[PDB]
Amino acid sequence: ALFEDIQAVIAEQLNVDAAQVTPEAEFVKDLGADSLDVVELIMALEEKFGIEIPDEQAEKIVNVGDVVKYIEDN
């Protein structure tokens, strides 16, 4: 599933437990990331899923739902 997949990349990149990584969970406030962490995370995801995330979109991405709903919509 695309969720378990991305959730995996998120949990390993941000060194947190999978159970934390929920659609509602925020990269910064909830998962302890800093802005640069999300930049690295996004690049690893673009790599993994071979899809480009235009900057306008990347800056709109606040939670794990935002990132998932993008990848699968694209």
Of 34, 37, 66, 73, catalytic:
34
**Torsion over CA of 11, 12, 17 and 21, rounded to 10 degrees?**
0
Number of domains in the chain: 1
Q: Could you tell me the two tokens for 24? A: 């509602």
CA-to-CA dists, residue 26 to 10, 29, 31, angstroms: 11, 6, 6
d(CA 4, CA 58): 21
Q: From which experimental method does this structure derive?
A: X-ray
Q: Which contacts of 36-43 are long-range, i.e. CB under 8 A and separated by 24 or more positions?
A: 37/13, 40/13, 41/9, 41/10, 41/13, 41/14, 42/67
Active site residue 17: no
- How many helices (H) and strands (E) in the chain? 4, 0
Domain that holds residue 27: 1-74
CA-to-CA dists, residue 4 to 47, 55, 56, 65, angstroms: 17, 25, 26, 12
CB 50: neighbour CB atoms within 10 A?
7
d(CA 40, CA 19): 21
d(CA 35, CA 70): 19
